[PDB]
Amino acid sequence: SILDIRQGPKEPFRDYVDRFYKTLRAEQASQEVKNWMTETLLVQNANPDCKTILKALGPGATLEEMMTACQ
Amino acid sequence: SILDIRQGPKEPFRDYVDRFYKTLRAEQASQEVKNWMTETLLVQNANPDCKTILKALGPGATLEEMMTACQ
């Protein structure tokens, strides 16, 4: 179900982040899982432009940095 | 780096599974993270036909079942 959280073509990155972590919270994701999801599925399900930017940023970007990049 | 493990267009699913978990093992993924990755990124980075089959199978499929589906 986290799998179906995908950033909409005109959806601000911040709104997609809100929905992504809301879903993790409902699925009782541990902090460890949360860290992994942030570095993987959060990037993979971003929209084409944001996904591109996040991949350029690279793994180990913090959420703060991803949000800056895709604003 | 798990992010760059993607099933090749003619790559048997089993070979992609081998590479996917090898990479998790090198990144010292916990069992909890391993379970989450299996239900999410393993499916997301499968090739177009296999990804389609795995999504039809649905979340909560075991690896055994995913392997059966994409053989």
Nearest-CB residue to A44 (from B29, B30, B44): B44
Picking from A3, A40, A55, the nearest residue to B2 by CB comes out as: A40
Cβ B2 vs Cβ A35: under 8 Å: no
CA angle B32, B34, B39 (to 5 degrees): 100
**Chain A residues within 8 A of B1 when measuring between CB atoms:** 59
Beta carbons of B60 and A27 less than 8 angstroms apart: no
Interface test with A, best of B2, B3, B54 (most A CBs within 10 A): B3
* CA dist list (Å): A30 to A57, B44, B62: 25, 21, 20
* Rg (chain B; Cα; Å): 11
Identify the three-state secondary structure at position A55. Answer: helix
Q: How far apart are CA A13 and CA A67, in angstroms?
A: 7
Can you state the percent helix, strand and coil of chain B, rounding each to 5? 65, 0, 35
> How many H helices and E strands in chain A?
5, 0
User: Are the Cβ atoms of A3 and B39 closer than 8 angstroms?
Assistant: yes
Amino acid (one-letter) located at B56? A
Resolution in A: 2.0
Number of domains in chain B: 1
* Integer Cα distance of A53 and B31 in angstroms: 30
Which residues constitute the domain of residue B48? 1-71
Q: How far apart are CA B52 and CA B70, in angstroms?
A: 10
**Region label for B62, one of left (φ > 0), alpha (ψ between -120 and 50) or beta (otherwise):** beta
Name the experimental technique.
X-ray
Could you give the CA distance from residue B51 to residue A67 in angstroms, rounded to a whole number? 28
Distance from C-alpha of A44 to C-alpha of A54, rounded to nearest angstrom? 9
How many CB atoms are located within 10 Å of the residue B9 CB? 8
Q: How many CB atoms lie within 10 A of CB B59?
A: 13
CATH number at residue A29: 1.10.1200.30
